[PDB]
Design an enzyme around this catalytic site. Structure first.
Site, mmCIF file in Angstrom:
data_model
loop_
_atom_site.group_PDB
_atom_site.id
_atom_site.type_symbol
_atom_site.label_atom_id
_atom_site.label_comp_id
_atom_site.label_asym_id
_atom_site.label_seq_id
_atom_site.Cartn_x
_atom_site.Cartn_y
_atom_site.Cartn_z
ATOM 1 N N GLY A 28 0.638 -1.240 0.125
ATOM 2 C CA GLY A 28 0.104 -0.063 0.047
ATOM 3 C C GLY A 28 0.801 1.219 -0.100
ATOM 4 N N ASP A 160 4.518 -2.637 11.441
ATOM 5 C CA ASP A 160 4.613 -3.973 10.718
ATOM 6 C C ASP A 160 4.702 -5.383 11.442
ATOM 7 O OD1 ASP A 160 4.031 -2.877 7.994
ATOM 8 O OD2 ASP A 160 6.188 -1.945 8.224
#
Ligand SMILES: Cc1ccccc1-c1c(N)c(C(=O)c2ccc(F)cc2F)cc[n+]1[O-]
Length: 344
Positions: A28, A160
């Site tokens: 993204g 993440d």
């Protein structure tokens, strides 16, 4: 109470976001923006093709469930998540919003020996978020400087966590992507656990102290050799635990080496830093210091506060063992999008 969205081309793509978000600029794909409702600088991520396969649909769900769970100062969480869709049948895009930090730990430290207190503060924050992550039985598993978001006040958030996605070519050669990985996960010695993240913290801490990568291996085997040279070759007890007969068999081919003296490796460093690295960089994952235990270590006496080191509510990942179809993952994703409550 459906807000009004406006359209805009950024990163070769049409972003459609609520009006509250202004001054989008690529960063993204991710855009920095100003959130007029909260007054905060925010990072907005638009997921690409979140539902193009079973694997991506599950990844999108996983990312959202993970980001929805984390409410901690040292872990990136969600201020907002939205879609321009009005119903499930037209639901297609997911946008995730968090605090804009604007740099990572490299964009600050690479090739730099930092002061002891800066190292104290950064590592304390990593360990503080890690206690929180690990308390939820979540494993980051790819912790490294580029997954640490940091702003100008040296305030730090972990990014993440919980995604297990890296391809073989990304892990091959002289690459930052593997240098912070615990040996037992690098070479698939065993069904690993959360102690792999403590190995990564030790690698990062060492690098902040010396200005150099600790284990800059040119390939997996070169990197193993650099690691065993510092920490010693496996003793008999650890060998048994290597359930991977192939791995076990290779390790037993290596000349036995003793653990080096950390005080002669990290010359001049705070003895409490050296001591802590010794408890972090232990080959047998069972015996590594945990995040909770490390926070109580004397190195962090200036920052440690047991009343402000929260743990998480439990994290239901029963979905990981679940086989579903694309559109069932999409529906579960939609539910999570539309059930989202913003924080105070
Ligand atoms: C770490 C960094 C360096 C430079 C620019 C932005 C960022 C950055 C992000 N890439 C991200 C980021 O990737 C991100 C993660 C989860 C999410 F829901 C939304 C996001 F934008 C978040 C925050 N910052 O500050």
């Amino acid at each position: 109470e459906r807000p009004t969205f406006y359209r805009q081309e950024l990163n070769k793509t049409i972003w459609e976001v609520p009006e509250r978000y202004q001054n989008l600029s690529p960063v993204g794909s991710v855009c920095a923006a100003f959130d007029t409702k909260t007054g905060l600088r925010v990072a907005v991520k638009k997921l690409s093709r979140p539902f193009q396969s079973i694997i991506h649909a599950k990844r999108t769900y996983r990312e959202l469930r993970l980001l929805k769970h984390m409410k901690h100062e040292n872990v990136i969480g969600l201020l907002d998540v939205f879609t321009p869709a009005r119903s499930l049948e037209e639901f297609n895009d997911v946008y995730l919003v968090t605090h804009l930090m604007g740099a990572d730990l490299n964009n600050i430290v690479k090739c730099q020996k930092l002061t002891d207190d800066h190292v104290q503060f950064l590592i304390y924050q990593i360990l503080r978020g890690l206690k929180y992550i690990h308390s939820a039985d979540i494993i980051h598993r790819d912790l490294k400087p580029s997954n640490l978001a940091v702003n100008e006040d040296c305030e730090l958030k972990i990014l993440d966590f919980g995604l297990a996605r890296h391809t073989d070519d990304e892990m091959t050669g002289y690459v930052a992507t593997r240098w912070y990985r615990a040996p037992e996960i690098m070479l698939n010695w065993m069904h690993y656990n959360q102690t792999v993240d403590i190995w990564s913290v030790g690698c990062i801490m060492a690098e902040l102290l010396t200005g150099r990568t600790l284990f800059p291996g040119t390939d997996h085997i070169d990197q193993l050799k650099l690691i065993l040279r510092l920490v010693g070759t496996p003793g008999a007890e650890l060998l048994k635990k290597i359930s991977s007969e192939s791995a076990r068999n290779y390790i037993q081919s290596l000349t036995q080496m003793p653990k080096m003296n950390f005080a002669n490796v990290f010359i001049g460093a705070n003895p409490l830093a050296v001591d802590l690295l010794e408890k972090m960089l232990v080959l047998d994952s069972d015996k590594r210091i945990t995040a909770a235990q490390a926070l109580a270590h004397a190195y962090f006496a200036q920052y440690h506060d047991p009343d402000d080191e929260p743990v998480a509510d439990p994290y239901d990942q029963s979905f990981e063992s679940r086989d579903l179809l694309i559109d069932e993952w999409k529906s579960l994703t939609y539910d999570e999008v539309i059930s989202f409550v913003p924080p105070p």
